[PDB]
Design a protein around this ligand. Structure first.
Ligand SMILES: [Ca+2]
Ligand SMILES: [Mg+2]
Lengths: 222, 341, 111
């Protein structure tokens, strides 16, 4: 790859396959989001097959590929991590033996940390018991620029937090998929439901004029 | 009478015991106090293959050891695995066992790894897994876990605690430290951890065959320094009764345990300190000879002691048999070989 | 909170100790709650049909912060029936009708 001034590029590594790439890319480049200005770079050690070539070509201006590994500190020099911004890690959810998958992910994090300490990392995990080991590696900074997203924890968390009130699971889970508003005219429930499906959750700084007021009052004002 | 010298002037010995008499738990570990000792962390399960724990503790318990300057040993692992082996080594003084898993940051705090003098990690299951990238996982992860475990109160940072790991596939050696200029092309004897003397592998031994053939007796000499000594009588009895035995002391047995010892000596104190600014390693060598005959054949020196800017990293590297004129910084170590009991 | 994370990793078990004044205050964290319609004071606006009318008065005097509507699956048809499944609509506009039988997701202030 090459580095171009004025922009930013990220990296991915892990279980690269048609389903995962389609879902991730769909969520990443969806038009509803704020004006996006990034590029996407993949790595893998199996030459992608014909079917996936379709997706990697169709976004000829936003996706680039480089065969290699992630454990070889020459490959991780090709991709130019030393000027990147993050490195996500797709992890295989439907594995046979859970333990091997997260072990391999652990070692991947280890190597990427080995090449550079000041990097950002966002990954997946499969059981809370093994999540803790990642707390140990020397440069993870939970306080600054780092994080980790499990599945089992979030799964049971959604279910439990919905135990107190029906359906809360769906209401949460729909807030984190980018969707656009739709037209339905038949007087079914589908129209009234899609009415609220396409909502999302965003963040922004406030205005200086609202400092000296009351949270209920400012909520009502908003 | 004394029953402390296993019928030959080679090791110390006592009566056999049972697991309950040595099996501790976390509470007693909190109650007890240890200092300057060695912990061995052993992974594996019952389905795993055997590994030869017999030989490890042996030279540690050499008969060249004053009973008031011994070394204590504690094992950490799973008790069900250990039982399969303890039938071998159930005759040695001052050994302890602790259930658990070396990954538990809490458990190791009990053994007081902070103020130890040594550490060692062994793997056993590595011979069954197929993918070479899979094994050594636990060893590396535990090593970093030790290296990063913060402490409170001497020694305060996880870098200061020494550790001697072990691993099978050579390349993985690039994960042991952070500030390493890692590379896959460089072969093992030049990467940082090995010359730092905090790593090891079975591969480097393969050269012995060569030096074995050109001289018969070489292989004996090493077995002298490393295992402490294997006279024909000892190996004969070992083959005979499959387990060590011990008779009473004899006038020849007392004189038997008179064999030299490998050790280290500092510089910031002692009668040799006046030579700390001496600067000539040869001066140290000759001066040591005439007063104690202490053979000096190795300089173990700070990694960054040669630069100009000051720093605080505290790893060390080894130089063997330097010429007569080599400058000495006041702060470093020399290997030595004592001659008395 | 980071504090629990640290303890969680170190002891491999949650642990507790005699309570202290600071620990007692800690529990002001708010909770997820569901609220019925046909009873309670809010039932005065049972047929109000304006989610905004509920929204303004809810938190103004109770910190009762509402964001979700939960509705019977056949609640709109002319013909009557008896199915008892319910769907969810999130953050309705200001002028959405409200049948006398519905559920409100909400956040309850204090303890
Ligand atoms: Ca390393
Ligand atoms: Mg391009």
């Amino acid at each position: 790859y090459s580095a171009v001034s004025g922009r930013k590029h990220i990296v991915v590594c892990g279980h690269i396959t048609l389903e995962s790439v389609s879902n991730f890319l769909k969520d990443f480049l969806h038009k509803d989001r704020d004006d996006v200005n990034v590029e996407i770079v993949f790595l893998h050690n199996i030459s992608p097959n014909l079917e996936l070539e379709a997706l990697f070509k169709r976004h000829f201006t936003q996706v680039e590929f480089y065969q290699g590994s992630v454990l070889n500190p020459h490959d991780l020099a090709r991709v130019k991590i030393e000027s990147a911004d993050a490195c996500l890690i797709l992890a295989n959810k439907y594995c046979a033996d859970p333990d091997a998958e997260d072990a391999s992910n652990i070692m991947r994090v280890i190597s990427i940390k080995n090449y550079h300490p000041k990097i950002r990392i966002i990954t997946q995990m499969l059981q809370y018991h093994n999540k803790a080991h990642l707390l140990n590696i020397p440069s993870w900074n939970w306080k600054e620029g780092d994080d980790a997203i499990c599945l089992a924890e979030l799964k049971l968390g959604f279910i439990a937090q919905s135990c107190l009130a029906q359906g809360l699971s769906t209401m949460l889970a729909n807030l984190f998929s980018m969707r656009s508003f739709i037209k339905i005219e038949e007087d079914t429930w589908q129209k009234y439901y899609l009415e609220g499906v396409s909502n999302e959750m965003y963040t922004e700084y406030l205005s200086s004029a609202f400092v000296g007021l009351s949270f209920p009052t400012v909520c009502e004002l908003c | 009478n004394v029953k402390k010298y296993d019928s030959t002037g080679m090791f110390h010995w006592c009566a056999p015991k049972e697991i309950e008499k040595v099996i501790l738990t976390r509470s007693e570990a909190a109650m007890t106090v240890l200092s300057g000792h060695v912990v061995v962390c052993i992974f594996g399960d019952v389905s795993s293959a055997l590994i030869g724990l017999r030989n490890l503790v042996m030279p540690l318990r050499a008969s060249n050891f004053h009973y008031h300057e011994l070394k204590h040993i504690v094992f950490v692992g799973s008790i069900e695995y250990l039982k399969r082996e303890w039938e071998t080594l159930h005759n040695f003084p001052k050994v302890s066992i602790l259930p658990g898993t070396p990954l538990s940051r809490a458990d190791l705090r009990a053994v007081n790894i902070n103020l130890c003098d040594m550490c060692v990690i062994l793997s056993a299951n590595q011979n069954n897994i197929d993918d070479t990238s899979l094994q050594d996982k636990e060893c590396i992860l535990a090593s970093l876990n030790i290296k990063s475990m913060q402490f409170d109160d001497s020694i305060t940072t996880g870098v200061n605690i020494p550790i001697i790991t072990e691993l099978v596939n050579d390349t993985n050696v690039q994960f042991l430290d952070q500030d390493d200029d890692d590379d896959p092309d460089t072969e093992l004897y030049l990467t940082q951890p090995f010359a730092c003397g905090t790593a090891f592998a079975v591969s480097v031994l393969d050269s012995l065959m060569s030096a074995t053939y050109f001289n018969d007796n070489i292989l004996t000499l090493i077995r002298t320094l490393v295992t402490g000594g294997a006279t024909p009588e000892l190996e004969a009895l070992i083959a005979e009764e499959n387990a060590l035995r011990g008779g009473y002391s004899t006038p020849q047995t007392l004189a038997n345990r008179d064999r030299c010892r490998v050790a280290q000596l500092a510089l910031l104190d002692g009668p040799f300190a006046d030579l700390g600014d001496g600067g000539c390693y040869g001066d140290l060598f000759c001066k040591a000879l005439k007063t104690y005959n202490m053979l000096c054949f190795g300089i173990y020196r700070l990694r960054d002691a040669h630069l100009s800017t000051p720093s605080q990293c505290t790893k060390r590297y080894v130089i063997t048999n330097p010429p007569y004129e080599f400058e000495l910084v006041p702060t470093d170590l020399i290997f030595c070989l004592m001659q008395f009991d």
